[PDB]
């Protein structure tokens, strides 16, 4: 990408005019002015810009501050004043597809100068301009997205009289419900620009406290949380899709006093010593509405600490009680599933060759039938997951399984219908799949589901990285097993699955080596397996002391949280009800009364904390 | 339950009354008072509370305090003295279960204000009202106990000057030995809201302290620690029971000096440089009462922080002479039950098919005398801990054992007497469960009994989870690999049992798999068998890199503390002879006259401490 600004590298004249407001002297511009009346051009022209980006005059004098003061800017408002075009230059753009629409105020309000800003829009430039490059998109390797606006770029910035003169000037006030091409207003890029180190999260706490607060100043008609960008999403919402927690805690639990006490949504109702009574606000923070901040937090986020945003509360409180209102639906799926399984067992079991037989074929169309309608519901939960199917796919893989193990019996079903002896194998592979996808029903309990999410340690990459190794290794010397046994001076190492399984039987500890006279090249088999044996030993002991150097770290205990993140995966898996019995779900808290007529259904949290009420005493 | 307070939230008439005095206007409150007169009514009445809970509207003056004060508590105080009532308000209290009793004296404390409750009980309040509902029990969620009166909240609150004023105030003294509906005086009330957080700690120390000693003052005569509640227990022993540590602690070791000398316990004795001679005080702290520290710490508490107890002193030291007093009693009991064990394994191994056949009968006789002897002694242990049999159960776990073999042994006496040819698997399981509780004498010794509790560490609920989650697997390859190999084209995986022994004898190393062509589908029972390894290996894996990383994580080493809480156990039931001779027990210490005619029978400690004496120094 071309660069912006470079001190040494080349991109009136161009050139003249260039380094004369580089440098910026007010004097020598003069002489300029009439040579723009006799060939009837202007300053905007291709000629007069970077041909390739379209960076003008007055974007190099606002990108060059002499300690963010430059004398010359309005002379070129003065120029383009009387230079007889219609239109301006501050509302002039760049149109290279990096810095697409990159004005000049950008550049004004980038470099922290409240004077140039100042003097640019008390002039008449523009506050609405989308800067929308390559550059100002996120998610690429050297990027800024800001939100494509100038009052985004000057909140996201820190620069805080340049808000508030941009919200508050006589010229042009700045839209604080205004959007870029994505959809988003300044809230939801204060939430994109936002990371997880405790200062960002300090200073993006700190400017939208700041920025909501002006909102309620200048716009209190209208609410600046409650809009959407182009995908839908509040700046909750947001927060929660994109992963940033700590502004997404922030604005779960958000307490102000007096005047701004309307846009607060954690609300005291009492308190007695150590024991306080918070109301929280449910707006769009439970399952009831469509798309809310439970279900993006479950089933929309693709972060790491997804599973630290079900701890917080009213997170907490509302998973506590769904989950107490549905455990014994959760119990009664589990037996379903393990009268299934048991059917599923004794039906396998009593199988005949290749009034008793009777009651097998019940069991049969039993099985049939519970293979369809698992296979059915699982097709159900994956139609409505088809927006995001590597998100049902990154943390909650029993759902494949739960599908897998129903396509499998269902296929085997209908090859023992049609007549042929291969349905066995695919019976027994889904026999061993259900016992095996029993253990999902392990989260409902508190004390073995900790241990379930807490058995899962080793990485399934870190375990099939080894396999490729150890695959390696075992094919190598199986293939020089079989072609030194090949010959003789009953006889082993003679196929290499043969042989493969020999070697393998090492790892297990049944492994035999031996000094076999059978052989010809007895002394070198014998070496050839004393080696395979030293070097699978120190291949098995790296990747346990590797392993467990990686694991062993005295890392934070996640246990409880994603065992919780699981709990809320499953209970709003299950508030939706079956494919067949779609139910109503509850309106989760007390619609109250708060302030100014704005009725919040607000669900009431009751929560002790001796340290809390201790350092408050 | 009901908010208290709600401020927002719908719970003179009833809402014009309450809303003029959550304001608080001394004078719109003018035109009430006749009102009460002609209708006969007055202002506890259920029309003009919340009928629900009864909070009455000097509950809500109370409750809403203009920065702590409130300019209209006096003017109803002075509508309830002539609103012609023969009883009061200021004694009425709430009726629902959860705020039953909740008075507005206890309001008038917990927000703080001296001015409302000098003016509450300057105007005729009771000061011993027992705030008794479930809001006010311990061990529920969203509770507070603070003691159930008034100046057990002011103390429980840190409020100085309101328990100095309640305890010294001419209109009404509060009772500093009064009680709860429990029994609980306020000693016993700072110790249940205790916690082992050091700043939570070094409060209720400072408030017990204090109280103490403004004990001293008011009450001298009767001694404050001496009372006991409905379950017959000091603030000591309460802390002993309740497993707070730290101001159990400091009750043990005290020390004042001045006028405050008679009440401590840790009197010195002398100095000598770094040697410092203490004279703890045995008040109820050692085995000769019915029902002290010792028996409390052991057989009473249910904690986790109970085995750090016995670290200190004067409790190191008592538990010292009293294991160096017993311990030849202990290994006398480790040799008698060597013996009996010998004639076990030497009956057992001599035993006949189904002079020597009378010495085996002589063996066969002892046999049962021992067992009935251990079977009698076993249930008096457990006869005299019939209160707390989950206090048996939670960490000796070799009471059971013994219980157990001496049963099985005593019932494969009688199956031997009885004819019956199913004595002999009894008497083995007697035999493997006498040599595996030899094993429970090995606290006696100093290095192996640290070993021993140091062995411990695997959980015993995590090594059953792990048996959950392996029974699972190997169940359900078992019955896949019987039903795959339920046909030919010797014969292995023939019944469940023998497949699951056969699935078994990998985990311990013996396990085969073959290519076996007597099989059908022999690819899918090889493969079948190869999924099996990997995955019984990955779950091994995951156990032991879990299982280690739980464990080596820099924790304490308790396991000094433990093994000197299981000699505790060992000295304290041994302490009462055995179920025949019921020994009587030494008076530990010797009887001191110290201070005023109050002799202690004290117990002097000998300790040394380089680090203390040079920072005295
Ligand atoms: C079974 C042996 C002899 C021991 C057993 C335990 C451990 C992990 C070390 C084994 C061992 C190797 O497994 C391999 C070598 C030589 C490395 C070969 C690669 C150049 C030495 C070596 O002591
Ligand atoms: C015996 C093998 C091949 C190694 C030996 C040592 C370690 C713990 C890893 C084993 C192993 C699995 O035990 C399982 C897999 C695949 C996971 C199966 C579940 C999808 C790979 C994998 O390298």
Redesign the pocket.
């Given at each position: 990408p071309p660069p912006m600004e470079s001190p040494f590298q080349r991109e009136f004249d161009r050139d003249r005019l260039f380094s004369v407001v580089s440098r910026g002297v007010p004097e020598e511009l003069t002489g300029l002015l009439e040579y723009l009346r006799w060939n009837s051009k202007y300053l905007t022209d291709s000629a007069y810009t970077e041909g390739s980006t379209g960076k003008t005059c007055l974007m190099k004098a606002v990108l060059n501050l002499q300690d963010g003061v430059n004398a010359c800017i309005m002379p070129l408002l003065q120029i383009d004043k009387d230079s007889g075009n219609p239109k301006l230059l501050v509302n002039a753009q760049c149109t290279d597809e990096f810095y697409q629409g990159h004005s000049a105020l950008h550049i004004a309000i980038e470099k922290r100068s409240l004077q140039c800003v100042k003097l640019l829009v008390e002039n008449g430039a523009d506050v609405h301009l989308r800067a929308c490059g390559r550059f100002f998109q996120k998610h690429q390797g050297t990027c800024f997205y800001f939100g494509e606006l100038p009052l985004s770029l000057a909140a996201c910035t820190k620069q805080w009289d340049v808000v508030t003169y941009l919200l508050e000037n006589p010229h042009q006030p700045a839209s604080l419900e205004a959007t870029d091409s994505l959809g988003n207003t300044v809230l939801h890029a204060l939430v994109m620009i936002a990371d997880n180190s405790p200062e960002n999260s300090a200073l993006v706490i700190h400017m939208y406290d700041g920025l909501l607060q002006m909102g309620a100043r200048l716009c209190p008609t209208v609410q600046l949380e409650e809009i959407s960008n182009h995908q839908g999403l509040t700046p909750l919402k947001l927060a929660a899709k994109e992963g940033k927690i700590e502004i997404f805690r922030h604005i779960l639990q958000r307490e102000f006093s007096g005047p701004y006490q309307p846009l607060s949504r954690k609300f005291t109702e009492w308190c007695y010593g150590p024991v306080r009574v918070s109301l929280y606000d449910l707006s769009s923070v439970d399952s009831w509405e469509k798309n809310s901040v439970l279900e993006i937090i479950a089933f929309h986020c693709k972060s790491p600490n997804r599973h630290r945003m079900v701890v917080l509360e009213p997170l907490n409180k509302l998973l506590q009680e769904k989950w107490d209102r549905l455990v014994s639906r959760f119990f009664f799926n589990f037996a379903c599933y393990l009268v299934y399984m048991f059917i599923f067992t004794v039906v396998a079991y009593h199988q005949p060759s290749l009034f008793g037989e009777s009651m097998l074929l019940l069991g049969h169309i039993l099985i049939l039938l519970g293979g369809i309608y698992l296979l059915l519901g699982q097709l159900w939960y994956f139609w409505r997951r088809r927006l995001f199917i590597w998100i049902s796919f990154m943390d909650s893989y029993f759902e494949i399984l739960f599908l897998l193990q129903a396509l499998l019996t269902v296929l085997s079903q209908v090859l023992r219908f049609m007549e042929t002896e291969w349905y066995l194998p695919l019976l027994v592979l889904s026999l061993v799949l259900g016992w095996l996808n029993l253990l999902y029903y392990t989260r409902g309990f508190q004390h073995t589901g900790i241990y379930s999410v807490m058995i899962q340690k080793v990485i399934l990459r870190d375990?099939?990285r080894?396999?490729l190794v150890?695959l390696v290794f075992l094919f190598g010397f199986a293939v020089a097993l079989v072609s030194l046994s090949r010959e003789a001076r009953p006889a082993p190492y003679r196929s290499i699955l043969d042989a493969s399984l020999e070697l393998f039987k090492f790892?297990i500890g049944m492994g035999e080596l031996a000094f076999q006279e059978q052989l010809r090249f007895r002394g070198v088999v014998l070496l050839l397996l004393l080696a395979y044996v030293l070097l699978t030993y120190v291949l098995?002991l790296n990747?346990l002391i590797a392993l467990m150097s990686e694991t062993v770290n005295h890392v934070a205990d996640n246990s409880w949280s994603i065992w919780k993140l699981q709990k809320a995966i499953s209970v709003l898996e299950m508030e939706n009800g079956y494919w067949w019995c779609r139910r109503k779900k509850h309106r989760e808290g007390r619609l109250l009364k708060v302030g100014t007529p704005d009725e919040r259904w607000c669900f009431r949290v009751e929560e002790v904390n001796w340290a809390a009420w201790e350092k408050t005493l």
């Open positions: 375990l099939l080894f396999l150890y790892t098995l990747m």
